[PDB]
Design a binder for this molecule. Structure first.
Ligand code: SAH
Length: 307
């Protein structure tokens, strides 16, 4: 996670739609924005959030009244979407910050997106979309999520600019817990196949040192000198969720706390005790660092009011 000095968001207040773990809250808040709402039905989700944010993210949005959402300047939802609009039409915030999965743009040959986008314009908001790999922002991980920044045209914001990518210098190897602490994470497997051999120095691209089993989903081991592959919250394999990583001879899955650091979360974040869950949580959450950037530049555009 990044420590942002200029709270280019101090004023504005946002709601955490589809809360999750508060990836967005973490972010904007750094930017100084204030969180007025949050909703999330997942019990263990509602659990962690509250653990680190002292509130139970209001239940299932589907039945929640948009005439109930507080007034905000940013609605963050990394998802039904029709609830957003539903709300985004009622509470018409200034900026509507969203983010989703890589394939969101392409899906159904652009339907999903043609819909959403147009559901924004027919809703009166500029639509900005672009995909960024966490790795491209001081984050060691092959993650590709979509980021949609929408502006209520009234603001006439013709200058927002997604963050400019930058080489990184922090790899998985860097975010691991003192082996002693990851011992219960090993998995002695006789059927290991070293499709490849260890690497010198480091590199940003996900080094698949070797697979296990039919070597498919959650059936691969990556080095620690590469970048943690896409954490999944629904994966199935022997090295699911996090995947397996060649950590000193023995091969082990990544630790929840490790997941975090690799998700951009700060270490202070109280992660859910249901390791199974946490994983799923992180598999579903967002890369903070990136969020922080986009956030910044979001406020940084709102703040450029000349004469
Ligand atoms: N109808 C609904 N009501 C409330 N929460 C819902 C919902 N449908 C899905 N969700 C929740 O919305 C989230 C979409 S995943 C969102 C990522 C989140 N921003 C993060 O920081 O982790 C999941 O937590 C999912 O359980």
């Amino acid at each position: 996670m990044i420590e942002i000095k200029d709270k280019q968001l101090t004023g504005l207040r946002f709601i955490d739609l589809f809360a999750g773990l508060g990836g967005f809250r973490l972010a904007l808040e750094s930017c100084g924005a204030e969180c007025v709402y949050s909703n999330e039905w997942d019990k263990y989700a509602q659990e962690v959030y509250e653990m680190n944010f002292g509130e139970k993210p209001e239940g299932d949005i589907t039945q929640v009244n948009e005439k109930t959402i507080p007034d905000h300047d940013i609605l963050c939802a990394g998802f039904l979407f029709f609830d957003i609009a539903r709300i985004v039409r009622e509470k018409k915030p200034k900026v509507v910050f969203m983010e989703n999965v890589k394939n969101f743009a392409s899906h159904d040959n652009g339907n999903t997106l043609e819909v959403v986008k147009n559901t924004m314009n027919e809703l009166d908001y500029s639509f900005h979309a672009k995909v960024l790999n966490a790795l491209d922002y001081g984050i060691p991980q092959k993650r590709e999520r979509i980021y949609m920044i929408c502006f209520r045209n009234d603001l006439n914001i013709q200058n927002f600019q997604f963050p400019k990518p930058f080489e990184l210098n922090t790899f998985v190897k860097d975010l691991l817990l003192p082996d002693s602490e990851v011992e219960h994470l090993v998995i002695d497997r006789k059927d290991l196949v070293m499709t490849n051999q260890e690497i010198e120095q480091t590199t940003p691209k996900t080094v698949r040192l070797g697979i296990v089993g039919k070597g498919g989903w959650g059936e691969r081991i990556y080095s620690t000198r590469g970048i943690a592959i896409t954490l999944s919250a629904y994966g199935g394999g022997i090295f699911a969720k996090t995947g397996g990583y060649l950590v000193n001879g023995k091969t082990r899955k990544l630790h929840p706390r490790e997941c975090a650091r690799v998700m951009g979360y700060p270490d202070s974040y109280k992660v859910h005790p249901s390791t199974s869950q946490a994983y799923k949580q992180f598999g579903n959450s967002v890369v903070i660092n990136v969020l922080q950037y986009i956030a910044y530049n979001i406020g940084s555009s709102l703040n450029f009011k000349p004469y």
